[PDB]
Design an enzyme around this catalytic site. Structure first.
Site, mmCIF file in Angstrom:
data_model
loop_
_atom_site.group_PDB
_atom_site.id
_atom_site.type_symbol
_atom_site.label_atom_id
_atom_site.label_comp_id
_atom_site.label_asym_id
_atom_site.label_seq_id
_atom_site.Cartn_x
_atom_site.Cartn_y
_atom_site.Cartn_z
ATOM 1 N N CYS A 1 11.367 -23.126 -2.893
ATOM 2 C CA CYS A 1 11.607 -23.085 -4.326
ATOM 3 C C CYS A 1 11.301 -24.437 -4.950
ATOM 4 O O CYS A 1 11.816 -25.469 -4.509
ATOM 5 C CB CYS A 1 13.046 -22.679 -4.632
ATOM 6 S SG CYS A 1 13.299 -22.214 -6.360
ATOM 7 N N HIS B 1 15.112 -18.082 -2.941
ATOM 8 C CA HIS B 1 14.018 -17.963 -1.985
ATOM 9 C C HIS B 1 13.616 -19.306 -1.379
ATOM 10 O O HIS B 1 14.014 -20.364 -1.860
ATOM 11 C CB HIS B 1 12.813 -17.308 -2.652
ATOM 12 C CG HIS B 1 12.087 -18.209 -3.598
ATOM 13 N ND1 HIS B 1 11.009 -18.980 -3.216
ATOM 14 C CD2 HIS B 1 12.287 -18.471 -4.913
ATOM 15 C CE1 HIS B 1 10.572 -19.669 -4.254
ATOM 16 N NE2 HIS B 1 11.333 -19.379 -5.296
ATOM 17 N N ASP C 1 8.956 -17.986 -9.716
ATOM 18 C CA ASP C 1 7.934 -18.146 -8.678
ATOM 19 C C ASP C 1 6.999 -16.937 -8.592
ATOM 20 O O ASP C 1 7.453 -15.790 -8.596
ATOM 21 C CB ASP C 1 8.599 -18.385 -7.317
ATOM 22 C CG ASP C 1 7.685 -19.102 -6.331
ATOM 23 O OD1 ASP C 1 6.732 -18.462 -5.835
ATOM 24 O OD2 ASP C 1 7.945 -20.289 -6.024
ATOM 25 N N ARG D 1 5.403 -15.851 -6.206
ATOM 26 C CA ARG D 1 5.473 -15.180 -4.918
ATOM 27 C C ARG D 1 6.676 -14.242 -4.831
ATOM 28 O O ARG D 1 6.914 -13.614 -3.798
ATOM 29 C CB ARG D 1 5.523 -16.222 -3.797
ATOM 30 C CG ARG D 1 4.367 -17.199 -3.859
ATOM 31 C CD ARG D 1 4.552 -18.425 -2.969
ATOM 32 N NE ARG D 1 5.510 -19.374 -3.534
ATOM 33 C CZ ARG D 1 5.910 -20.494 -2.938
ATOM 34 N NH1 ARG D 1 5.422 -20.841 -1.753
ATOM 35 N NH2 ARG D 1 6.784 -21.283 -3.545
HETATM 36 ZN ZN LIG Z 1 11.458 -20.940 -7.006
#
Ligand SMILES: [Zn+2]
Ligand SMILES: [Cl-]
Ligand SMILES: [Cl-]
Ligand SMILES: [Zn+2]
Ligand SMILES: [Zn+2]
Ligand SMILES: [Zn+2]
Lengths: 196, 196, 197, 197
Positions: free
Chosen positions: B100, B97, B43, B45
């Protein structure tokens, strides 16, 4: 100890960022639209988002030992497929770097042990196919750098043969770049291999 | 375009850092001694080094789709073996997280296509074994968060059964932590699974 | 090179014999295949599926690895399963474990087997840990190895039953999945009672 | 369930016959194994190594996958190779490709085969790209499939020859490696002229 410090530092970074922009995290939790897939080395000195001076939310990344792109490896291929077919990233950056431990490992003649000799095998294959050239370099660190650059070129070739990637090139104009991060000067340069 | 901007930003970050500390990059090129192996989601982020507010050179990282730790996966196992047996990291942080994409994918009933259905299979297995609990959550985003937490717990179990990891626990006092990064508040919390 | 050249020689002899028995055997073989069974087994030299099942070339599609382990993310095994189930439309999937399995014994020992093998055998080592009470209570070593091999078949069946292609094919085609055990001492195969039905 | 139960029945018959022929065959089998050949082949139902080589259970250690592909980082195949070469001390490694290979044909087509298969077949697709001139010039489809399957054997041999365990075993034990081709139409196996010698 350092783990608990990492938690403290996370809370500090989050607090300062939350004061800087009260809408930063709420928009972040909203979704992502990264335009770059970064494939790099697990090396601690190569955090993609820091060395590129960017923000959380714009670099989708996969990191492994010696930034190796293997044709049948499902771990990497999952990241590529999700990035290209679902996130629609516009750029793929395969990054090698200087003083790579995996590169140095492939240059050695010993068994590294465990799974690593098998994982580094496509780098060792790169070693064997350019052995003339690599052996001709007197400086060890420049030899490590060179094999890391050749590893990037090879990984790019594999990427250019990935079907998900080539469909995206043909229909969306996906771009692919092979780069090299020189830790000594902290700069990233193009190696001249990729889409154009 | 954004790729060329990323190169510009790298040169800018490197220049500013090189003024900040003229010895920073030369020591960085000297070697690494990270004390943390971070395993997280690809990801965009979740750049580990930024969200932990740390520096290049102290977090050794592997990142894949949905931060999945699979027993026979050689990609991840190479990173773990190099980190634990060669770099001698003292902490292993498996981080899940919120929001997701892989988690959400595993919660869905459709074929995601390509390699991804096979890669997410251990998360789908987590889905099936806690189906009662997950289905009982009315809120979709809290369901995604929950399955991401359960995925972290499972990945930790696998890590605690890795031989390289347990040798390091038994002889060096290696620590293992399962954490969760909440994007909405930008904070990382412990889930309470790991070495102690 | 002797044993390899003997293998080529025996191949030529077998082909001569098969071709005299049935002059249309090979041309019909070359036309295509329609196996009804996918066999997943151990690489063990003592476990050739087509011989021990007393069947002919062209009716068993097979994948074989160390200790017949079916791992969720393993792309090698998943490719064979996908091709067998979605392209050839096999009607049966047979996960076969066996006695005197070296991988099983390896999982039961506590030493490093070395190389890649500890990682490949990790899901068998995981089965070891979760049944340590039962496994340790077995006084006979060979029955302990047999037991851990059977538990391994059961686990692999669970994984197969969670495979999406297999699960769909069960839902719409009535694909069947069977966990079996080949006992080398008597040469017989038994059902373990795990699978589709 | 019929064909599966028939397979169990035929197993019991084969075991009864083998046990009458030699009452010590099975107890000696259960004692251990000493195969001298590691066979790496295609999962194809028409390619059971032990039958086509006309040999007996206990002398061929085998790995089989889609289109007999040997990939450098594939842990599944590498486990079988490591166990075969470092533990059983096999003296020969036989990479066997064959005619009418479905994976080969899949690599020659330009459509998505779907699922995991495009990724597994990627190194065969890579061989396709590097020999596109030669492959495209072949007017006969079956000979094009045969050709790409042979080039696949050659590539797999190169990978095996760069494997560290194989390379060491060659250096100190005289381990031999052979690239062969099983032509289903005539049932014969030929050497491709690639390998250790
Ligand atoms: Zn993820
Ligand atoms: Cl049942
Ligand atoms: Cl030769
Ligand atoms: Zn590196
Ligand atoms: Zn076995
Ligand atoms: Zn085939």
């Amino acid at each position: 100890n350092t783990f608990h410090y990492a938690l403290s530092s996370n809370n500090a970074w989050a607090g300062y960022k939350a004061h800087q922009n009260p809408h930063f995290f709420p928009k972040l939790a909203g979704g992502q639209a990264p335009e770059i897939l970064w494939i790099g080395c697990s090396d601690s000195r190569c955090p993609e988002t820091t060395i590129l001076g960017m923000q959380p939310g714009d670099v989708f990344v996969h990191r492994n030992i010696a930034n190796i792109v293997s044709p049948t490896d499902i771990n990497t291929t999952a990241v590529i497929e999700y990035a290209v077919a679902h996130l629609k990233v516009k750029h793929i950056v395969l990054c090698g770097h200087s003083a790579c431990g995996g590169a140095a490992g492939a240059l050695s003649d010993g068994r590294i042990g465990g799974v690593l000799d098998t994982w580094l095998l496509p780098l060792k294959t790169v070693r064997y196919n350019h052995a003339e050239e690599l052996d001709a370099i007197t400086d060890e660190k420049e030899r490590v750098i060179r094999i890391a650059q050749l590893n990037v070129e090879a990984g790019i070739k594999v990427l250019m043969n990935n079907p998900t990637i080539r469909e995206a090139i043909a229909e969306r104009g996906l771009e692919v770049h092979g780069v090299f991060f020189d830790i000594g000067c902290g700069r990233i340069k193009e190696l001249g291999c990729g889409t154009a």
